[PDB]
Amino acid sequence: VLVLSQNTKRESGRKVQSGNINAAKTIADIIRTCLGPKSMMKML
Amino acid sequence: PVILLKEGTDSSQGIPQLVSNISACQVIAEAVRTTLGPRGMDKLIVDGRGKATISNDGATILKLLDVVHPAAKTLVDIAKSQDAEVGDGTTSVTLLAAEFLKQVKPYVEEGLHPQIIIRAFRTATQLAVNKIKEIAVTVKKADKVEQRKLLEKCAMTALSSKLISQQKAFFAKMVVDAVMMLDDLLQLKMIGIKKVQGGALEDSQLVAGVAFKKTFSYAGFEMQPKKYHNPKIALLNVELELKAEKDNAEIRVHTVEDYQAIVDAEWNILYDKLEKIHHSGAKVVLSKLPIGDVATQYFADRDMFCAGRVPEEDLKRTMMACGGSIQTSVNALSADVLGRCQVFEETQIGGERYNFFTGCPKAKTCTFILRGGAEQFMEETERSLHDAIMIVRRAIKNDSVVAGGGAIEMELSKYLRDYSRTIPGKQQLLIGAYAKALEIIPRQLCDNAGFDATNILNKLRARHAQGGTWYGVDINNEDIADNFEAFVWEPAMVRINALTAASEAACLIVSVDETIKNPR
Amino acid sequence: KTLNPKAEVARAQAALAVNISAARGLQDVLRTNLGPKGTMKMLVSGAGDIKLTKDGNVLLHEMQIQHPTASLIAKVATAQDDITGDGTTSNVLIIGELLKQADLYISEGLHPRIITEGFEAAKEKALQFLEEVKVSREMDRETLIDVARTSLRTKVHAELADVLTEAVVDSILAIKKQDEPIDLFMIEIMEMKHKSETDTSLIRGLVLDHGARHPDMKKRVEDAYILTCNVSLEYEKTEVNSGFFYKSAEEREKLVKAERKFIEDRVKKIIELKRKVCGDSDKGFVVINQKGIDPFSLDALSKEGIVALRRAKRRNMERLTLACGGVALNSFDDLSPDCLGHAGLVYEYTLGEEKFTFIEKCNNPRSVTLLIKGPNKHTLTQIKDAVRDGLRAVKNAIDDGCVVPGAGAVEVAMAEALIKHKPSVKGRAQLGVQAFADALLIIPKVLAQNSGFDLQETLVKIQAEHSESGQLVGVDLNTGEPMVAAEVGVWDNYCVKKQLLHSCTVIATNILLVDEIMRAGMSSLKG
Amino acid sequence: ALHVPKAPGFAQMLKEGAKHFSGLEEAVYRNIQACKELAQTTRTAYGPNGMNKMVINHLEKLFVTNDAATILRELEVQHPAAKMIVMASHMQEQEVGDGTNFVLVFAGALLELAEELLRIGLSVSEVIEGYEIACRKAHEILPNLVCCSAKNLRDIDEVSSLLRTSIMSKQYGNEVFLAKLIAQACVSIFPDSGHFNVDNIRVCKILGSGISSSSVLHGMVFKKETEGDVTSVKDAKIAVYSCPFDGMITETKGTVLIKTAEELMNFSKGEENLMDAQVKAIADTGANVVVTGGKVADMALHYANKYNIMLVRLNSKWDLRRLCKTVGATALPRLTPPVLEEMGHCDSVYLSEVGDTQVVVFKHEKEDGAISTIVLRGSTDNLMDDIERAVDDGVNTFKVLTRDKRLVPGGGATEIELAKQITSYGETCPGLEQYAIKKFAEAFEAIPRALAENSGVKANEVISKLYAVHQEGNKNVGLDIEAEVPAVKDMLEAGILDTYLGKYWAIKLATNAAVTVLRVDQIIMAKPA
Numbered sequence A: 001v002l003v004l005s006q007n008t009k010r011e012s013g014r015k016v017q018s019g020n021i022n023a024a025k026t027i028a029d030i031i032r033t034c035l036g037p038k039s040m041m042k043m044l
Numbered sequence B: 001p002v003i004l005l006k007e008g009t010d011s012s013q014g015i016p017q018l019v020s021n022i023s024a025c026q027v028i029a030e031a032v033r034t035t036l037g038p039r040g041m042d043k044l045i046v047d048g049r050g051k052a053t054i055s056n057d058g059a060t061i062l063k064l065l066d067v068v069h070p071a072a073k074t075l076v077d078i079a080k081s082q083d084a085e086v087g088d089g090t091t092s093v094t095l096l097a098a099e100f101l102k103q104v105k106p107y108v109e110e111g112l113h114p115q116i117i118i119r120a121f122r123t124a125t126q127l128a129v130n131k132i133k134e135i136a137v138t139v140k141k142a143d144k145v146e147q148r149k150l151l152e153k154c155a156m157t158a159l160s161s162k163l164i165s166q167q168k169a170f171f172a173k174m175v176v177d178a179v180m181m182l183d184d185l186l187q188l189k190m191i192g193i194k195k196v197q198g199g200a201l202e203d204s205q206l207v208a209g210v211a212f213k214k215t216f217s218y219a220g221f222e223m224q225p226k227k228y229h230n231p232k233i234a235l236l237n238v239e240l241e242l243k244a245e246k247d248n249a250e251i252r253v254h255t256v257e258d259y260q261a262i263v264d265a266e267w268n269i270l271y272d273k274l275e276k277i278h279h280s281g282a283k284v285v286l287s288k289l290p291i292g293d294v295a296t297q298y299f300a301d302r303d304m305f306c307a308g309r310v311p312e313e314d315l316k317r318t319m320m321a322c323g324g325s326i327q328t329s330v331n332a333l334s335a336d337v338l339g340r341c342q343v344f345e346e347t348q349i350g351g352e353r354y355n356f357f358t359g360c361p362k363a364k365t366c367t368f369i370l371r372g373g374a375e376q377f378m379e380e381t382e383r384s385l386h387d388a389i390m391i392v393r394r395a396i397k398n399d400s401v402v403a404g405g406g407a408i409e410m411e412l413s414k415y416l417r418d419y420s421r422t423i424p425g426k427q428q429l430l431i432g433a434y435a436k437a438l439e440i441i442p443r444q445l446c447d448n449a450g451f452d453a454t455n456i457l458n459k460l461r462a463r464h465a466q467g468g469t470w471y472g473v474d475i476n477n478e479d480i481a482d483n484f485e486a487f488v489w490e491p492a493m494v495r496i497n498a499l500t501a502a503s504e505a506a507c508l509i510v511s512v513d514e515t516i517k518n519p520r
Numbered sequence C: 001k002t003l004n005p006k007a008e009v010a011r012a013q014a015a016l017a018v019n020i021s022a023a024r025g026l027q028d029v030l031r032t033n034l035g036p037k038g039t040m041k042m043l044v045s046g047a048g049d050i051k052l053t054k055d056g057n058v059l060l061h062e063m064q065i066q067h068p069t070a071s072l073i074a075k076v077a078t079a080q081d082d083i084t085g086d087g088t089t090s091n092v093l094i095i096g097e098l099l100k101q102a103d104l105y106i107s108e109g110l111h112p113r114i115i116t117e118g119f120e121a122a123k124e125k126a127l128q129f130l131e132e133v134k135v136s137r138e139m140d141r142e143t144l145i146d147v148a149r150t151s152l153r154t155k156v157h158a159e160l161a162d163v164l165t166e167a168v169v170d171s172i173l174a175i176k177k178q179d180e181p182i183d184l185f186m187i188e189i190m191e192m193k194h195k196s197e198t199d200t201s202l203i204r205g206l207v208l209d210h211g212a213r214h215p216d217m218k219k220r221v222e223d224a225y226i227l228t229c230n231v232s233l234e235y236e237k238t239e240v241n242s243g244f245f246y247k248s249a250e251e252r253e254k255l256v257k258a259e260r261k262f263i264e265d266r267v268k269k270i271i272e273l274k275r276k277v278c279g280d281s282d283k284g285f286v287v288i289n290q291k292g293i294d295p296f297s298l299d300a301l302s303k304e305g306i307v308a309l310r311r312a313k314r315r316n317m318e319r320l321t322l323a324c325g326g327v328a329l330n331s332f333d334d335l336s337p338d339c340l341g342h343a344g345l346v347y348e349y350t351l352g353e354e355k356f357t358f359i360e361k362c363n364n365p366r367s368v369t370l371l372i373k374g375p376n377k378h379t380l381t382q383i384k385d386a387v388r389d390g391l392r393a394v395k396n397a398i399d400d401g402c403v404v405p406g407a408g409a410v411e412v413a414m415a416e417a418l419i420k421h422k423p424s425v426k427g428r429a430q431l432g433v434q435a436f437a438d439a440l441l442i443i444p445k446v447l448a449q450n451s452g453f454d455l456q457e458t459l460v461k462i463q464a465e466h467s468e469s470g471q472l473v474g475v476d477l478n479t480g481e482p483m484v485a486a487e488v489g490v491w492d493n494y495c496v497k498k499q500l501l502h503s504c505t506v507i508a509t510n511i512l513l514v515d516e517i518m519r520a521g522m523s524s525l526k527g
Numbered sequence D: 001a002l003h004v005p006k007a008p009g010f011a012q013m014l015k016e017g018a019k020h021f022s023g024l025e026e027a028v029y030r031n032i033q034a035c036k037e038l039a040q041t042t043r044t045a046y047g048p049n050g051m052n053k054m055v056i057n058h059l060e061k062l063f064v065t066n067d068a069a070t071i072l073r074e075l076e077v078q079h080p081a082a083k084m085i086v087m088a089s090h091m092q093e094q095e096v097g098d099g100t101n102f103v104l105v106f107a108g109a110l111l112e113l114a115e116e117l118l119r120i121g122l123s124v125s126e127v128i129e130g131y132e133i134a135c136r137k138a139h140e141i142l143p144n145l146v147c148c149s150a151k152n153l154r155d156i157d158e159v160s161s162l163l164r165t166s167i168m169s170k171q172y173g174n175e176v177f178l179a180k181l182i183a184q185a186c187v188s189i190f191p192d193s194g195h196f197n198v199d200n201i202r203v204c205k206i207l208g209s210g211i212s213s214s215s216v217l218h219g220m221v222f223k224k225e226t227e228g229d230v231t232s233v234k235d236a237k238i239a240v241y242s243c244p245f246d247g248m249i250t251e252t253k254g255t256v257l258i259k260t261a262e263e264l265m266n267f268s269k270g271e272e273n274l275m276d277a278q279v280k281a282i283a284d285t286g287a288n289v290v291v292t293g294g295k296v297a298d299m300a301l302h303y304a305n306k307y308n309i310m311l312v313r314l315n316s317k318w319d320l321r322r323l324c325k326t327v328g329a330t331a332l333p334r335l336t337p338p339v340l341e342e343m344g345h346c347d348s349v350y351l352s353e354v355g356d357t358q359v360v361v362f363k364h365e366k367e368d369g370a371i372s373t374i375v376l377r378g379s380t381d382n383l384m385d386d387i388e389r390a391v392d393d394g395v396n397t398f399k400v401l402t403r404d405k406r407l408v409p410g411g412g413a414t415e416i417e418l419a420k421q422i423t424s425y426g427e428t429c430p431g432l433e434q435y436a437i438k439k440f441a442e443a444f445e446a447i448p449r450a451l452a453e454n455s456g457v458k459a460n461e462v463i464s465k466l467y468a469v470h471q472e473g474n475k476n477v478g479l480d481i482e483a484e485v486p487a488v489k490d491m492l493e494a495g496i497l498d499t500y501l502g503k504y505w506a507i508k509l510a511t512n513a514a515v516t517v518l519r520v521d522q523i524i525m526a527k528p529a
């Protein structure tokens, strides 16, 4: 078996951009809870 | 979260999918690339059961390839279509499609609209069809000798790149006589192809009647003479053996008197049927149902021949050769329902007993006896015979031959280049690439023959530009000559059909930018 | 949650319900350790050790519970225990009752911010009422005795409780001062495995866990002198690597005597000091060393009748210096007789493999030693924990210039004050004030449930008796009749209750403002 | 490490394999994203410039077509919202048969806009009310945009000019010949008083040349052969028989009971005499070809070939009824020879072979008739399937035009005009539904943008030019396809017409799907099996 690279995965551009935008939106929606004086405390 | 499609779905974009399709098409075409001209070689395909398949035709090679690619199946489809239509140029259409795809690959990679490419392909195909129909030049009123010579030349040209190329001067007259005796409907099922082991290739003969293999025999087969001067063939379809009348019958016999009466009546019915069959004046009895041992011994005591287990196709061929009819009942055996022949023999060929039926002037069929190898050689000979028969049948209905080799391709390329040199814009490059892709036929021929392709192509282009039209390649003299004067003719229905199939395949392949595969 | 599929997370309602369930489960277990009428627990470890205790801080740690809220509650209880003292079970009960009262009003369409704002005002009012409801006394011996008896009544039975109370009071009065605060780390806790009756008294002196090593030394010594030191008396090598290079056996013997002359000089100096101190034969000499002693020095000191010790702790030197009054010197430079101690009766006691030393009969001792006696180990640990709790309670009552009656009259008074101050609060804080007032009445309810009487009727009778007469009417644990807590002798603490209320309010504010439990940490699993 | 427990209640009693989505982030937003991702798949294949799609199912079959219905049917999506969208598309195809990708794009745009409408702070009830009001307004102003109508329905030069716009969207390039063939086939089968049937069009796939060798037939064809020796008959009378061409027997199990030598010798003679008498009585009524639908015998076939009788055997049930309705004859449940009413009215029956396939052609000399057959040619099976699907779509469009002769301009002018009218009307509506109306007006711009993206030019400039043209005073002006520059062109002069009732039903179904999806805020599923 002749291969150029082993254990390598390449994606497109639109899909990568959509995934990055979705991750950023999820992070912003998760972090938006702790904002303002009426916010709540979290525990980890 | 829930995913959209099922787990196991594969997808891609447009440019990589098209590149993969072009690569698959090129890989598929590279397999049947060396099989073209007379200097080409055949292949050997072995399946899982251990059976070899040696055939020079590209159709069988593409069928035995077993390709599961969703895009590589376009070549097999057009190949099967060309084999079912005219049945000749099966690899030429694939080579042309591969060349068109390789020519449009850089144009697609550069960033061009596929609709413009499809329109250019359609326009080029229409222009090529119009040019071929214009430069056809067919005869208006010729004699029968001229038509026979044209058919013989077409058969010799079609049987020039096969395995029986050394004996192309013998099979041409045979296939001509076989096609000429096919009435007007041109029935291919009335041509029997028998393969008997033993003998040489030049020992093949063509009878003007019917001939089948000897079926099963009983103890009354050697007590009858297998030779008659002017016999009569009676076509039957009833069983001649001691059996019950009906399966859903019940006899409630009383004492021994009725038992003996029924026993005597069975033999009386049998003897009455035998006498009614014999009184028809026949000598040869043929039927599809097997014959028992009683009738075989009864027919041997009156110098009569009988044979059972006759196939349906063989019986139909015998009826078409003689002129009788299938008579299921024996209560109407006149003189117009029996066969007639001039000679009937029974010789041994290759250690197998065969029956010969010939001499009838009103024969509308024939039988071929192919000798040579054992299995693969016989199959190749049968395929070549079928291809020659199809070529002759197409030339009979088309009566318009053209020059072979590569003169028509060069003329089409020159016409396309001259047409593209006038229209400006982006339409010039596409037609130019389409014309340059048609020049791969002489290059492939020179590569298969082992000669210089560049110099030959340059000389052909110079001769076509300085014109001196039907000039192709030459393998014997290793130069260029006149293909129309060298008795190299081919039907015009092979080039147009192949061009249309290649155009359709290109339009179906280019207009695809997505590939979805479902699991299981 | 989409970025890490292998991570659990709770929402606003789920985490709140989980916290409420955990609080209820922790409250329903520790509700049987309030008051002296509680039940004892038997803890069995993984090795096979049995522990019989009644404190809540030990039960909250020996329960084997894996929960964040339970861990926080146990940490708060341990902090309260090692900062103040007795105040863990009641703290957990009040926290659970407050959480239940808050959850009762949360699942009705309210915001926890209003409940927190109401709880803040309720705690402020409770503190303002406690700042004026406290009673200041002179803090005599009877008050401390009653406080210790009330603190130790919820541990053992009666006679042992009174004995421990008397011992703690005597030790506190012995270590009592007029200018310096109550300093700990002075009373040695020695355990014994015999005489589990009336034997856990107070020893006016010090009891060590190591005796003499030379068998030729005297056992019972009358009037002797105490010498506290920590100088080394063994074969101490030099810091730089050296070596002997003798020639014959005479040089070897000379080098052997040379390395021992350094210790022989100190031995002769000690002998001369002892001869100068004594002179005749009616007195003795006791030497207390912190490091080891070579057998040569032990044999040399045994010829003069010296009972020296070796290998001691650091607190023993300070205890001896505080009791006898000597000087814990480090070198034998200015060895003056004024840096010695005075003793009275020194006898060595043997208990099989172990060996102890009794140093009693002193002039003016300031560091006593409590001799704990028990049949097994669990009883010894329980008595030690009870003594520690009593000492902490006595120290907290002494450090404060006021007293607070126990029982449950203070909680009823606080609830009545919060009810009277309920309509005087604007906004929607009335529900929070009512919840805080109803949550403070969990102590009398649990007390009446553990005593063996009714709850609602008892609470109604107590409220009626408190409203019909402005007195500190407590709750009886024998007949269920409304009695006075300040008349019998039930007393508690003020700073302890203040810290308990502050911790309860802090826990309530921290729990009611959390509604998200996420666990997105590393699994730390590779394979 | 500390492990967080579960909520004591529905979380603990949720059982394994099941899921729960109570919040709007894990339900409404998830469904909106799934619908957007589903609509983004078939977005590039919309107008005539849309490419094809090679879909391979689990049966190892190829599907290289252009219609979105087959693609959606060959996806097997495990999503509830996508399943509802597929069901709505199938319902639209069953009702009309020419509007699936448009409905998908409309629903996707509506859901993508409702996402931000709920994100900014608006509720679901006000959005649903505004969407319903906008849909009612669009349906009210829809009949006020009719600019063309069908005059005659039996004219060849008129019907072919109407379905050409719908055929060009599927087959770009070679569409005039297909439109002419469809018009001729519809005219040859068009009776009187309306009532056009959709099951009177047959499709025969024969491998041969290309699309230029296709031709229509005024009859029916079968992929069988002749059982007897009779080749072709000129003036023949077809005699259909539902019963098999054999001797009838009893349904109850019964055997024959022969006696001595008399019955044993006379039974076969009497049977043969009865068979010969029946064969003679069948052929004495003027019949020349007998079409059966069961198993034939050898003696019957021989007796039919003796009297020159053509035998045609077929096993398809519906094919027999179609052949009976084409020639006007009926069926018979017993071997009974006809007299004068159950005869045959054919013209020419012959057996030919084209493309190495022997087929029996029943050509009729009458220009009218009952049903017809469109013989299609091609080299590949995918192209033949695409041509058959295009012919079916053209037949459906012709049926829709016959049901309603109201024509509306296509391309991208009607949607732009409707959006402009909704935006102009929505500016005078107070409350909170004005934002929903303005969003519904913006959802109509997803068709011109997709068309401009598929053509190969910009979309914003084309939209601005179309808006300026509509504001100037023109209405029947849309985008251009053959023009390489972003410009506009008149739709009435070029001949771009579409069905009004079909578009109305498509918009209605899209609005119904939108208001049905925008009503569920929590999904409760279980475990797959």
Ligand SMILES: Nc1ncnc2c1ncn2[C@@H]1O[C@H](COP(=O)(O)OP(=O)(O)O)[C@@H](O)[C@H]1O
Pocket: B035, B036, B037, B038, B088, B089, B090, B091, B092, B157, B158, B160, B161, B404, B405, B406, B473, B488
């Ligand atoms: N005797 C000949 N002289 C010149 N050209 C020939 C001759 N025989 C075959 N060819 C050329 O070889 C090509 C291959 O033909 P053939 O092998 O018969 O079928 P296919 O085109 O399917 O390979 C034809 O295009 C023909 O022009």
Ligand SMILES: Nc1ncnc2c1ncn2[C@@H]1O[C@H](COP(=O)(O)OP(=O)(O)O)[C@@H](O)[C@H]1O
Pocket: C033, C034, C035, C036, C086, C087, C088, C089, C090, C091, C150, C153, C154, C406, C407, C408, C443, C475, C477, C490, C492
């Ligand atoms: N003898 C008693 N008389 C009245 N009340 C008592 C008595 N003993 C204990 N209590 C009450 O029981 C409550 C619980 O005391 P305990 O469990 O010993 O310690 P903690 O207060 O830390 O829980 C105290 O608040 C106290 O008021």
Ligand SMILES: Nc1ncnc2c1ncn2[C@@H]1O[C@H](COP(=O)(O)OP(=O)(O)O)[C@@H](O)[C@H]1O
Pocket: D046, D047, D048, D098, D099, D100, D101, D102, D165, D166, D168, D169, D170, D410, D411, D412, D481, D496
């Ligand atoms: N010749 C044309 N000129 C302009 N627009 C066209 C033409 N043909 C089709 N279209 C547009 O392409 C769109 C797609 O039509 P079609 O694929 O037939 O059905 P669907 O709308 O269901 O996809 C239609 O909305 C129509 O407006």
Ligand SMILES: [Mg+2]
Pocket: B087, B088, B089, B090
């Ligand atoms: Mg060939």
Ligand SMILES: [Mg+2]
Pocket: C086, C087, C151, C154
């Ligand atoms: Mg206590």
Ligand SMILES: [Mg+2]
Pocket: D097, D098, D099, D100, D169
């Ligand atoms: Mg459509």
